[PDB]
Amino acid sequence: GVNQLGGVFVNGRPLPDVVRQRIVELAHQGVRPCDISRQLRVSHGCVSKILGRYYETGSIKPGVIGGSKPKVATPKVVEKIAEYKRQNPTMFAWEIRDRLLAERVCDNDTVPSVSSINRIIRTK
Template structure:
């Protein structure tokens, strides 16, 4: 964690722990806290051959790299921007995992944000403070 635990954030923001966890998960999956569209089919942003090649390079260089790490690296290295990173509106991580399955024939172990660490906490490298810009640290008047 960077910062405070989700249960503390939920008390500060006066929302359920599940709500905070869902927002953190959405941020880790998509890079945004905006809710997804409800209903309808979602257009898929298919990875270009160049992006697929880069994904394959990243995975060969670091076989333990997770899909969300690949997405972050594609963005950081300027290979894609938020509008062109492989997505399906719902999740760029799912699209990257699809590329990995097609190339390497196996499922990425970090697809499911509901997987839990041994201590029962959800794994996240993002914090509510980082997402909200420390707005949750205000004291009530």
């Protein structure tokens, strides 16, 4: 994609480190953000966020994009899984599920799937 200043951009992706770098630099040299923006062909909004994060952080590294937070893999639930396995190291994945239900730790909706629960064991 091409912005209205004439710049080349990739919708969704961070501005290249080499450029974020230049942005900070020019600002350091005393160039006004509106000029940098108009010059380096970058939306003043963007120049703004970058400069601001740098002044507030010291980095030119953009935030971490993507991922998600746990849904079923609740903190407590993750522990219960450790407790059950610790008690009986060979209890099956589906048996842990029934125990989580039997002790009301999870609903018929909260309850983590077998795959997930074995995934919890593996990764913890």
